[PDB]
Structure 1
Amino acid sequence: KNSLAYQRMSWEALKKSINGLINKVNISNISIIIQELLQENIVRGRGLLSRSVLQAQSASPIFTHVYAALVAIINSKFPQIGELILKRLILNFRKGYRRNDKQLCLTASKFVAHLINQNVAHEVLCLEMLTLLLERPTDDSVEVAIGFLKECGLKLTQVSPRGINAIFERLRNILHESEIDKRVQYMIEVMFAVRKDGFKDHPIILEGLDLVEEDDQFTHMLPLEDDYNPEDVLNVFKMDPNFMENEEKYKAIKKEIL
């Protein structure tokens, strides 16, 4: 009926607008595109919003930073959405890894490293990722750890240098005491280069990717081997009997959060 047709038109047009904004989010418009993704209720379709976020982090290895600053902007207020994004990236990383999918594992590790640098993903989960990649390091898994580290070596080494020491020692052992080739040799060499350079070629977050205050953010820890769930079925809409009440709630919350 009229309420159902209104809900369907809302779902459709809002989803199209939110997808356009997620692919439109820039660095010179991170705050502006964040306020535009907020002006429409990003929480009504939080499943589909985090799905657009995951798509941005996956399909573009070069815009994972923008999706990351957006995830931080949206999680420092609503940690549940960025939390779903973290669960989805954990699912995608475990999928790429467990199924030997180089590209998907690499993209999901890109999103997770961007999260660990944006201070939305904890150090124990990054430790678990680096350890599972370096458990039986081959060219592929060691290089995956190397790509993760080329971006997230600042967060782990500045928050908990124990991670840096463990990473360096384990790398030295598994790449100097096992039948590893010039591939893993040069991956370890790139690792040592990034380390000794003091992480100047890749900071935690470039200008515009981390602007939230010290404790005014949200760093939730959902693990890799913990039985997380994607909860992305919400990317398909659903009828709402209380669309009016919940809509007033979301609109007033958007007013109180801007």
Structure 2
Amino acid sequence: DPLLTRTGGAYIPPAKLRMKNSLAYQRMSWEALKKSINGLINKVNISNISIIIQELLQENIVRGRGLLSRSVLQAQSASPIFTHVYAALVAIINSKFPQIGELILKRLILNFRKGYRRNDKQLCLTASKFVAHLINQNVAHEVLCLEMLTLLLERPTDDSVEVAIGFLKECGLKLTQVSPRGINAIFERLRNILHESEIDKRVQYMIEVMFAVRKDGFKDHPIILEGLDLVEEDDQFTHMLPLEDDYNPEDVLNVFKMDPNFMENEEKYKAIKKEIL
């Protein structure tokens, strides 16, 4: 905020604005790509995800993999109400470009850790919610959920328990299926907190809620909503990314830079596009 440089002036409508070359063209194409992605990410919802994917795939999302990752991550952070939809979108892209799903996951994990470190509850709540749904979508391995829950529950605070319980609600049904002993360990831990600890009303209530959810079999928290399970089981690529690893977010990929092999790299992508359509 006080660090980032300040660029003022009036917004100018595109219709109004329109009323060497290699660099100029790469920059222009870069700017159009960023805008196109931004629009698609704003548009995506359950009823239109397939068309959004098709329109997204027309763009060079390899060259713009950082741009796409950033747009999806910013969108989910501002609009966690659509987390399930962003997860499904990521799941489809990852099935075709696993390296892009991996880049999103790496940054999301780092985002969660930043939030935890800074005691930024909201960011912990939204980043964890995203993790849960990427797990639901088999984009990320459940070891990440288990490790985050253990971290949150080690020195339980009102905020740390809140994050953990909201998180377990979202990925719990999936957890139960792929790692019943793991989720059992989490519940035992919650049980020890509920009795073998000196807790306040807020913590006690959130835990009783979590046990209540498990008893009804997560009836209000299905793994994937009808309309979003769009990747065939065997076509998905499940990344095994632990919580603690020293991931490189590669945010430098978000910044425009002249590409000497721009020609080759461009023709390379269209060869990919024609493949998966």
Q: What is the TM-score normalised by the length of structure 1?
A: 0.98
| 236, 245, 251: which one aligns with 1:232 | 251
Provide the secondary structure at the position in 2 that maps to 1:26: coil
Deviation of 1:207 after TM superposition, in Å, equals 1.4
Deviation of 1:170 after TM superposition, in Å, equals 0.5
Q: What is the TM-score normalised by the length of structure 2?
A: 0.91
Deviation of 1:42 after TM superposition, in Å, equals 1.4
- Structure with greater Cα Rg: 2
Cα deviation 1:212-252 (Å, max 9, x = unaligned): 11121011012211111211221111111111111111111
Which of structure 1's runs of 4+ aligned residues deviate more than 6 A?
none
Cα deviation 1:41-84 (Å, max 9, x = unaligned): 11111011011111122111101111111100100110111111
Aligned alpha-carbon RMSD (Å) = 0.9
Deviation of 1:126 after TM superposition, in Å, equals 1.0
Deviation of 1:175 after TM superposition, in Å, equals 2.0
Cα deviation 1:114-146 (Å, max 9, x = unaligned): 111111111111110110011111111111110
CA distance in 1, matches of 2:60, 2:213: 41
Cα deviation 1:81-134 (Å, max 9, x = unaligned): 111110111011001111100011111101111111111111111110110011
Deviation of 1:208 after TM superposition, in Å, equals 2.3
CA distance in 1, matches of 2:176, 2:214: 9
CA distance in 2, matches of 1:230, 1:3: 28
| 33, 40, 45: which one aligns with 1:21 | 40
Cα deviation 1:177-232 (Å, max 9, x = unaligned): 11111101111011011101111101111012222111210110122111112112
Q: Does 1:77 align with 2:75?
A: no
Does the 8 Å CA contact 1:222/1:228 hold for their aligned counterparts? no
Q: Which moved more, 1:229-238 or 1:152-161?
A: 229-238
CA distance in 1, matches of 2:268, 2:67: 19
Identity of aligned residues (%): 100
Deviation of 1:148 after TM superposition, in Å, equals 0.5
Give ranges in structure 1 of 5+ residues lacking alignment: none
| 141, 151, 157: which one aligns with 2:160 | 141
Cα deviation 1:7-35 (Å, max 9, x = unaligned): 00000011001101011112111111011
CA distance in 2, matches of 1:154, 1:56: 25
Provide the secondary structure at the position in 1 that maps to 2:146: helix
Deviation of 1:253 after TM superposition, in Å, equals 0.2
Does the 8 Å CA contact 2:146/2:183 hold for their aligned counterparts? no
CA distance in 1, matches of 2:58, 2:238: 25
**Which residue does 1:64 correspond to in 2?**
83
Does the 8 Å CA contact 1:76/1:212 hold for their aligned counterparts? yes
CA distance in 2, matches of 1:245, 1:186: 59
Does the 8 Å CA contact 1:115/1:121 hold for their aligned counterparts? yes
CA distance in 2, matches of 1:167, 1:208: 30
Does the 8 Å CA contact 1:57/1:110 hold for their aligned counterparts? no
Q: Map of 1:67-216 to 2, 5 A cutoff?
A: 67-216=86-235
CA distance in 1, matches of 2:63, 2:123: 28
Does the 8 Å CA contact 1:48/1:232 hold for their aligned counterparts? no
